[PDB]
Amino acid sequence: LSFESVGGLDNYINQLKEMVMLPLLYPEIFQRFNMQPPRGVLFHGPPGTGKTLMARALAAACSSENKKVSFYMRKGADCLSKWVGEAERQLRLLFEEAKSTQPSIIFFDQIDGLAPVRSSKQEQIHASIVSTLLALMDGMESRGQVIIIGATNRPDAVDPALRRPGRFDREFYFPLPDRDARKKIIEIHTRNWDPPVPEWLCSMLAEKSKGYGGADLRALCTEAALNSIKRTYPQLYRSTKRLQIDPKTIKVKVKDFVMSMKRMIPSSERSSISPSKPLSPELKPLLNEAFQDIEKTLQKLMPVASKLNPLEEVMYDDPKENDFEYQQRLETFETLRIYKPRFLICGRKGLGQTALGPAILQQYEGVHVQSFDMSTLLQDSTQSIETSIIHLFLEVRRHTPSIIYIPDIDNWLNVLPLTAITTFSSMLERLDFSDQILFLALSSSPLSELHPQLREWFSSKQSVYSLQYPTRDSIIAFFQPILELIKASPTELPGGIPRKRRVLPELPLALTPLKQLLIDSTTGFTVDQLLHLHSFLYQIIWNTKSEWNRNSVVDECERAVKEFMI
Amino acid sequence: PLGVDSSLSFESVGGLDNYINQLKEMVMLPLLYPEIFQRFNMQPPRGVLFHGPPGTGKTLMARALAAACSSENKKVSFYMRKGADCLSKWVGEAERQLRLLFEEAKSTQPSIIFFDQIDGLAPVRSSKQEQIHASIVSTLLALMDGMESRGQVIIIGATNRPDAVDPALRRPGRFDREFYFPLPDRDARKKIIEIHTRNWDPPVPEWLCSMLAEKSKGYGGADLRALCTEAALNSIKRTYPQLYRSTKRLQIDPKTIKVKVKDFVMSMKRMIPSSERSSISPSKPLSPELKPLLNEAFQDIEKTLQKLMPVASKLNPLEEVMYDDPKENDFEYQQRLETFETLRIYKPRFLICGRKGLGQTALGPAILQQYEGVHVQSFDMSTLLQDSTQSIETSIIHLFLEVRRHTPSIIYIPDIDNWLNVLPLTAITTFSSMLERLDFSDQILFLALSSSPLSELHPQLREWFSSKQSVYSLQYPTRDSIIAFFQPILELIKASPTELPGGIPRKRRVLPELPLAPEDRLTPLKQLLIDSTTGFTVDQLLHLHSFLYQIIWNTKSEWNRNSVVDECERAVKEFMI
Ligand SMILES: Nc1ncnc2c1ncn2[C@@H]1O[C@H](COP(=O)(O)OP(=O)(O)OP(=O)(O)O)[C@@H](O)[C@H]1O
Ligand SMILES: Nc1ncnc2c1ncn2[C@@H]1O[C@H](COP(=O)(O)OP(=O)(O)OP(=O)(O)O)[C@@H](O)[C@H]1O
């Protein structure tokens, strides 16, 4: 498994192949420069993302070389016992034995349980284990060629004196795979699968996922395998002994995947709500004209161009790299292009925004979002609201680029007390004018009457977008799938045929006028009520899903519309 | 492996020279000259603490002392010791191994003892903890200085937090002396970047040191070696990208790995210092695009702050005595000297105000960087309400107990008008109940930059300062300063093709295989930029300074200028409305 069954994390592999693989085959290249090359890593991130996978793949891609790189394991707090001087005696002969087998690695795991923050508010035994392990990582004599690797979820409860250079000195991050890391993950765990899956749905299964992560994508593919067995042999669930069965007659088809997509929740959505979903396809030919102008405007206010791996960036050539100037020109153009970006979707009540906000918020992959709205700002009663505001700002300031997102800003100013509006408005000006954070907001009161604090923010005419209601020569495309359904129904719709019952073997032991009428009857409607007509006459199609005569339903759905204006 | 050389004798230590001389007065010169110590009939003392933030030179000062005495001349002996190894399961042997230790050292009369991470060994004697820890400190309290003299054994301790040890151990006679390594400030980083590059065959030029000293603002001694070993490791990646993507040795000419300049500045973007992993330092220098708008006002505040609290740097005591003493035996010439530079200061306070976006939040955290050797902590909203466990008043108490420690320091509060509208009234009184009960001579400041301008401010501020010399009001930018601000833009509008770094695209590099081993319309625009911008504050000026760079970014490589002016007027024509 020599680094082949790990997808997406290409950049950290080349940074890892200089600590254990490349002082060892080229020792003379480190003796000109008189250096250590360093011996510490630290892994941190959200749960289920490929953390302990790399520490297993690394110790499997070293023993297959006959170079004899021995290593060790830990299981959290495991050098801890009831006797007095026992808890430190293990840590002496752990590092002692590691020296006498000189090329050696040590893997801790969940180091939060072992080394907390030193304070006088706890027992004294947790101070001695921290103070000892801090001391023999670099004493006044060296520790030999010993590489230390740790991992945890919350990288803040470890002691800050244990995060110095010389001890850990290299922090990584596994940020919940974005778009096409999921394309490679879902093709690793479905490798052989003898009628092999084509490319045209592996690019489709990636797009439906928006935050499964590397631990849930294996559970998606292993559930669709279990759904395929139930399709071909239902007799297996109704026995106790073995049966004469034959493999190599089961094929994972498309239906086994999509029925496994519907009944599975991912890992990070079981507690929270995760506000992002794409546009509804029935809603598409009414808002995509207004959608593209917003996506084109946001490129100017925050360019979010991707990151290149360094081995594909140094492979080019460049003639003039000696001067102190022209080095302060590459990142300078990408620095003052941005200056405090902000945006709104203001307009009338319900003609837009509530289905257009989370359409934008699922495009950016690249990022880390938050939500400063209700139901997450006051959903606990232990702290105040002036403390839960500060805790989110401490998170959004790291892991740039980021997005602050508030839906329904108009009621948001009438509910929070006034000593919390000032606290939120204070932290917006402490951070500098050049970092890459955004500020989305969605209002419902139209222009020239909005609240006098939304004018103190956003301070421009570029960062406000009006939302006028739609363009009569586009509504004839909105009802176009309906008129393709009022045309005759020879069970074109799914239904009408009570299909079949499968017999099982034994398996022994071993149309002109209403189209005009739809036009000069609404003519001023908003989309909030345009869904109502689409959700009214759609019931009329369901009740006539099996009749065979079409000159009569079209008089029903003109009777259905003639009282709706009333 | 490869190892490091054990030939370090007081030369690989930069920026610390006061402590080397005091350390040389304990092991080297009671022995070479014993005849001049009974002439005063004295002890000369034996004992040292080492306390400070992590990674500032505590080891590689104790380590260098052993190599400088063992390689000097015969003979000396020394005992290593880890954190806490002198305690085990059975009842009394934690005290047996300690009594074996000092007895063995006494039989080898010139000797020193290294205690490392002493907080695991001797905590504060209290009844809330199990008393085997109170026992082995008590026998160590009596073994250092008891009924019989211990001999010539010197004790050295290292500590990150110098407050958890017992106060009966810091008595003079047992430890006698405390040091403090203060996170190397400005000029110490010039040498501490120079020692670690005793250097490569293209030796590092002097003009970028100090330039890496200026960019560093709180790295320290540990991570500055990590900066140099990162850029050197980046150079191997440049000159041989075929070193990866293989398994065996290939071929190496280890001479074409000369380090260029670009590897340093690329390595500065990826490194984060050890002090800012959790918190955030409130200091950033002036941005070079903004400097001709504020440089006149920056030196004016600097000139006023020199008379309020002088903080001028002082010297090591060996260089002081090289100046000859004049006729001096009476303490009347020198009793002025302590009366002076004590009564020259009187409650130094300061406050910066004006209209919004007219200066401050930029020059605020800029004077906090230009002078060093002082302690900074921020009484901010993100630091008071940060902890949800304890009360809000206790956090104001626990910071005043810290700033009355070591040095000249600074109480720094941004945006004071958003203050007093968030905190309760019972906390505002408490913070005002500590500024008065400290004396009128401690060198502690009260920096506070503020909102909405003079004669409109609620009067709790107007008795805290209450003096004409301790308030400052900015103004709008003048006419003759604005045309200097837009000068690099209009310079960049002409010299198009080979100047912008987006012109000729970079070509591919070939790879060897490496086998195995055994002015026409310009002045219309120039006059247009004035007579349209007469009353702008300094923050919305930065809008148009940003709105013009997007224009040239789309035109990064197009030729035929005198066709790129026609879009800039309709930009600025939109702005006044
Ligand atoms: N790209 C991938 N391909 C196949 N499996 C993966 C991939 N990424 C993650 N996994 C699965 O995730 C599991 C755990 O990995 P990792 O420890 O990084 O997740 P985690 O969320 O950190 O778990 P924990 O937080 O409990 O340590 C592995 O068993 C592995 O099967
Ligand atoms: N002047 C210097 N030149 C080169 N390296 C230095 C210098 N000062 C300190 N260092 C580096 O600091 C490291 C640790 O030294 P020291 O133990 O004094 O720091 P520390 O903060 O006390 O660490 P700890 O608190 O963990 O003992 C050494 O590895 C050394 O490389």
Numbering used by the authors:
A (entry chain D): 263 to 772, 1131 to 1186
B (entry chain E): 256 to 773, 1128 to 1186
Quote the paper:
ATAD2 (also termed ANCCA) is a histone chaperone that has been implicated in nucleosome density regulation by histone H3–H4 loading or removal. Although histone chaperones responsible for nucleosome assembly and disassembly usually do not contain ATPase domains, ATAD2 is unique because it is the only known AAA+ ATPase histone chaperone. Here, we demonstrate ATP-dependent histone H3–H4 deposition onto DNA by Abo1, the fission yeast ortholog of ATAD2, using an in vitro single-molecule imaging technique, the DNA curtain.
We first solved the cryo-EM structure of Abo1 in an ATP-bound state to 3.5 Å resolution using an ATP-hydrolysis deficient Abo1 Walker B mutant (E372Q). The atomic resolution model revealed two layers of AAA+ domains arranged in a hexameric spiral, with the AAA1 domains forming the top layer and the AAA2 domains the bottom layer. Densities for six bound nucleotides were found at the interface of AAA1 protomers. No nucleotide density was found at the interface of the AAA2 domains, consistent with the fact that AAA2 has no consensus Walker A or B motifs and is presumably catalytically inactive. First, Abo1 subunits have a molecular clasp where the “knob” of one subunit locks into a “hole” of the neighboring subunit by an electrostatic interaction. Unexpectedly, after building an atomic model into the cryo-EM map of the ATP-Abo1, we discovered a lobe of extra density in the central pore that could not be accounted for by any part of Abo1. We modeled this density as a 14-alanine chain, and examination of interactions between the polyalanine chain and Abo1 revealed that the W345 sidechains of Abo1 form a winding tryptophan staircase around the peptide, where the middle subunits (B–E) form direct contacts. In the ATP-state, Abo1 assumes a closely packed spiral that binds the histone H3 N-terminal through its pore loops and the histone body through its bromodomain.
